Symmetry: C9
Subunit: 56 residues, 9 copies
């Protein structure tokens, strides 16, 4: 049960901040039906990542 | 009786942060009907786990 | 029980059940045409991460 | 007029935390119509009750 | 005309926590139409009242 | 010209009106088929409790 | 260098908001999923924040 | 070479926002599930946030 | 072992955001519940968060 170390944490946040990452969400396909799909990680999230990298 | 220990907490946080995990959500299947489904844990929740991990 | 108070360890055991994915919550699910029904879902990733946080501060 | 004291506050939070409480919500009954009903208090709200009991 | 002092505040918060209060919300009545009505105060709000009472 | 600045007791008078359930806010309300109108409803519980909290702190 | 609001001008603005004077632009339904831009009174929540800022001043 | 917005510059921008000079792109309903991009004034909550930050300067 | 953004890199990225040079991907209604992916300007809320941080630096 490995544990992510502080520098591996800064790496993962860097990828997010650099627009490199995606998240799964629900997307309308029509008449109420939805499908799973991947979208870029949002501005809000990318900013939080940027905030943390700055506190490093 | 079980109380998750501090190291075990980091382990669990690590599995989330590394995109290994899912949550149960509702998804539309047509005309107002929904199904229970599993999706990846969001960027938002991953970044929080990542934040907690960098403060350890 | 009308004056039962959860003690510190009880709180941590309860958070541990949440954190470990052993708990549910009652939500409203759509069953067609605007109609909803009560159902139980796994506690969310967000709520589990709060429990984890809390267990990590202990 | 009554003022809840600390011990009563913790008793009330305890029932919440233990999943013994309900809240009134709006539930869809068809074609935009809704009705009042009671649901279990949410995980979020329970978890806040625990955090508060953890701090006493 | 009036300013609430701290003990009056607690009195009002107590009513809320004890579940003696309501709030006005919009409820659907069908075909997009909504109607004003009252519901019990939510658990989130009741918990906040509790939190303040226990910190008094 | 000197513009108005709410003074200490005036803020408390306003929060008190809110807390007491004397005030309203403007919101959009469905009237049929996706169309909405503007109306007033009572300030909500969350907002009243925030007013109360600020009153307690003063 | 441009225009920067001073500490007083901030309070003046906040007071107009707290006093129910201001509005904000929102989207309103006009039917069948279609919406239009309209203005509405600044909300209770936003007025309470303003009151707060004025209270801490 | 690359730009870093300095403290004074930030206050100028926040001031434009607090005054009601700025807008944001949002999705608006146009009927039957269709939305379109359009601009609206920056909301009250966001303006009050700019006001808070300027107030603390 | 892998790339980590340094402080000035962070400020540069935040500056792009505050300045309204950046977008985000979202889902938009195209009809009858159908959605498609598309890019929108970064919202005011987020631009003000970037502004705040820059002010802090």
């Amino acid at each position: 049960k490995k544990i992510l170390q502080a520098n591996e944490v800064l790496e993962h946040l860097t990828r997010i901040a650099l627009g490199q990452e995606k998240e799964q969400v629900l997307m309308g396909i029509g008449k109420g039906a939805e499908t799973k799909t991947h979208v870029e990680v949002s501005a809000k999230d990318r900013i939080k990542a940027l905030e943390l990298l700055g506190k490093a």
